[PDB]
Amino acid sequence: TIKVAINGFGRIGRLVFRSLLSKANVEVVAINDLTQPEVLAHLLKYDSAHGELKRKITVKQNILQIDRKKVYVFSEKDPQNLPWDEHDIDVVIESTGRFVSEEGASLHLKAGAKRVIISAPAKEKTIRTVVYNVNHKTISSDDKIISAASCTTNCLAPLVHVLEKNFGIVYGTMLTVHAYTADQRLQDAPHNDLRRARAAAVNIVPTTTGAAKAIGLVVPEANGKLNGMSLRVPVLTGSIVELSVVLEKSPSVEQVNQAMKRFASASFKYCEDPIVSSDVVSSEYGSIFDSKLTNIVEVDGMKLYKVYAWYDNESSYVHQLVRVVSYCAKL
């Protein structure tokens, strides 16, 4: 039974908190953000995309109570000042978006936490990076910092895994059409990415995706074969990946779809219905394969394979991260 602190009680941190309430072997004993406890308790209870948390939620001083559970609430901008040794923290979930480097995440280790899971790709290629049910068994008990990759990586990685194991990828491209996130702007405002600066709910916004630099770390044999980008669009949550690849073998559409069905798990859903993004909101699958969209572009004997998967960039990622935390409990 491991003790967890959540650094950054935001969209990802709060949903991870919600999900950990039902995991028996994991207790969140502390959270940290930049505001009063009452604000966090209110944002924990009411969630624009994922509905109300139907538990009695109280605040007394810096103590968040959820029915009978007591959670210490801190407001410390410098994680090295967090009292992780005093609270015997086993794992910090680092979900501020502000400590994704090895040095940044290790400030929690200096504070006394035994292990850090970054809710994003790490800055360095040397950090252990996992997608649950693709390569999480590569985690070592010696890994002090672990990256759970990005939302798009968790969507993309099962597809790449299946194509690589079954057919062999030569090269390809990916594109995610992706819900806007808190890194964008409600009204046109300063941002170093001059397109993420732009009013997010009325704009198609081209930008980077973390899946580009993380996919080769999760499926090593696909390293260097894919690139792509993100078009952020005005939906609150919910996203889709289009992957177009040249394969070594030449399967039929039916064989590609069957290869995906066989990899179905708690992390990978085989969908057969003509759905749209809102149908995956709050999903617990890290990836939802859209088998009706699979098609081949065939020109003079050349074949370009196109496959699609959905993901709730919040919930899908959150339950993957939660699966990683539970696995670390057994370590």
Positions marked active-site: 151
Which residue lies nearer to a second copy by CB, 101 or 244? 244
DSSP 151: H
Closest approach, Cβ 74 to ligand NAD, in A, equals: 8
308 contributes a contact to a second copy by CB under 8 A: yes
The two tokens of residue 57 are 């939620």
32 contributes a contact to ligand NAD by CB under 6 A: yes
The per-residue b/e assignment along 97-122, b for 16 or more CB within 10 angstroms, e otherwise, is bebbebebbbbbbebbbbbbbbbbbb
Site string for a second copy, 146-185 (x = CB under 8 A): ------------------------xxxx-x-x--------
What, of ligand NAD, a second copy, none, does residue 9 touch, CB below 5 to 8 Å by kind?
ligand NAD
**Number of residues in contact with a second copy under rule CB under 8 A:** 46
Range list of β-strands (E), 97-168: 116-118, 128-129, 145-147
> Distance (Å, rounded) from C-alpha 219 to C-alpha 215?
6
What, of a second copy, ligand NAD, none, does residue 295 touch, CB below 5 to 8 Å by kind?
a second copy
> Distance (Å, rounded) from C-alpha 91 to C-alpha 60?
25
Is residue 247 a contact partner of residue 225, using CB atoms and an 8 Å limit?
no
120 contributes a contact to ligand NAD by CB under 6 A: yes
Site string for ligand NAD, 87-116 (x = CB under 6 A): --------xxxx------------------
Amino acid at 306: K
Tell me, rounded to whole angstroms, the distance of Cα 95 from its chain centroid: 10
Closest approach, Cβ 202 to a second copy, in A, equals: 6
DSSP 188: S
> Distance (Å, rounded) from C-alpha 308 to C-alpha 277?
12
Site string for a second copy, 262-301 (x = CB under 8 A): ------------xxxxx-----------x--x-x-x-xx-
> Distance (Å, rounded) from C-alpha 147 to C-alpha 300?
43
191 contributes a contact to a second copy by CB under 8 A: no
> Distance (Å, rounded) from C-alpha 14 to C-alpha 8?
8
314 contributes a contact to ligand NAD by CB under 6 A: yes
What, of a second copy, ligand NAD, none, does residue 204 touch, CB below 5 to 8 Å by kind?
a second copy
CB atoms within 10 A of CB 135: 18
Please state the residue numbers annotated as binding site for NAD(+): 11-12, 33, 77, 119, 313
